[PDB]
Amino acid sequence: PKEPEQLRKLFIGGLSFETTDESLRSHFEQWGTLTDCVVMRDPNTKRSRGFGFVTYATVEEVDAAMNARPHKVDGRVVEPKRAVSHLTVKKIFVGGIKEDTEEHHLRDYFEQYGKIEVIEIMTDRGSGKKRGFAFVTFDDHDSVDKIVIQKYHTVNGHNCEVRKAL
Numbered sequence: 001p002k003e004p005e006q007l008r009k010l011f012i013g014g015l016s017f018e019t020t021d022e023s024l025r026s027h028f029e030q031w032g033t034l035t036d037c038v039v040m041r042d043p044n045t046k047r048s049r050g051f052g053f054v055t056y057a058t059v060e061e062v063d064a065a066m067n068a069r070p071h072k073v074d075g076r077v078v079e080p081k082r083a084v085s086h087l088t089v090k091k092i093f094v095g096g097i098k099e100d101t102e103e104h105h106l107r108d109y110f111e112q113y114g115k116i117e118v119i120e121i122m123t124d125r126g127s128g129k130k131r132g133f134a135f136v137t138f139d140d141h142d143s144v145d146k147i148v149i150q151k152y153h154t155v156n157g158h159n160c161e162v163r164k165a166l
C-alpha cells in the first residue's frame with residue numbers, strides 16, 4: 001500500500017546548470033530510494049532549466065531529505081519543496097478549536113511538524129473571549145506543507161480545519 005506518488009516527490013529549484021539526472025540522483029539517494037529523478041531541460045538546446053524533481057519510495061524518505069537541508073548539490077545550495085496540493089508560507093490558520101483550547105495544546109501538537117515561532121490564539125476585540133481559531137507561525141515552510149496535506153488534525157479533542165495563512 002504505497003503512499004500516493006505526488007506525496008513522495010520533491011521539486012528541486014536553484015539547480016546548477018551542470019547538475020544532471022545522474023548527479024542529482026547520486027546526491028538525493030543519500031536519504032532514501034529514488035524511484036524517479038529528472039533534471040528539466042530545454043527541448044531544443046538541452047540546456048538545464050535550473051530545476052528538477054526526485055521521487056522517493058516513501059514519505060519518511062521525503063522527510064529525511066527535507067530534514068537534511070540545506071542541500072548543496074554540485075556546489076550550489078538548492079531549494080527543495082514538496083509537490084503542490086507552490087504557495088510557500090510559514091503560517092497556518094487553525095480553526096474549530098472552540099473556547100477551551102490553549103497555547104500548550106497547539107504547541108504540543110504542532111511542534112512535531114516544525115519549530116514554532118509564534119502561536120496566536122484569537123480573541124474578540126470587544127470582549128476578550130476566545131473566537132475559536134488560532135495562527136501558528138513556524139521557522140520554515142516544510143512544516144506547513146506537511147501539515148496541510150494531512151486529511152485530519154485532532155487537537156484538544158477537536159477536529160480542526162487547518163490551512164495556509166497569508
Ligand SMILES: CS(=O)(=O)N1CCC[C@@H]1CN
Binds near residue numbers: 068069070071072073
Ligand atoms: C545536505 S548536503 O549533502 O548538501 N551537505 C551539506 C553539508 C553536509 C552535507 C555533506 N555531507
